[PDB]
């Protein structure tokens, strides 16, 4: 059923659009920043950002 597949592609394409709008706002407009300076990435960076 091509029409079911096309409904699925259109729905996926809109959801991908939402996710792009969301992630771009989220990343660009965060007011805090933990700069890892290429070091102690993983848990320590995550705790530092918290």
């Amino acid at each position: 059923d091509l029409i079911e597949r096309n409904i699925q592609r259109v729905g996926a394409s809109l959801e991908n659009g939402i996710n792009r709008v969301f992630l771009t706002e989220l990343v660009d407009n965060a007011q805090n920043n933990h700069d890892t300076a290429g070091s102690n990435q993983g848990y320590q960076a995550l705790n530092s950002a918290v």
């Binding site: 096309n6 729905g11 709008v21 407009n29 920043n33 933990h34 890892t36 290429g38």
Partner: protein
């Protein structure tokens, strides 16, 4: 962090099939109006390389 969705009809994504009987084509179209905004950007920290 707020995902603001808008629709003139209903609330969610609006996806519709329609038939063109002049051309014998089904079109499937999707639309949505969206924006994303922080209420408090201080409430997020990015991790940078």
């Amino acid at each position: 962090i707020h995902t603001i969705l808008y629709a003139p009809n209903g609330q969610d994504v609006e996806i519709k099939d329609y038939e063109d009987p002049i051309r014998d084509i089904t079109g499937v179209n999707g639309r949505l109006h969206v924006d994303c905004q922080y209420s408090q950007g201080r409430s997020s920290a990015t991790v940078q390389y």
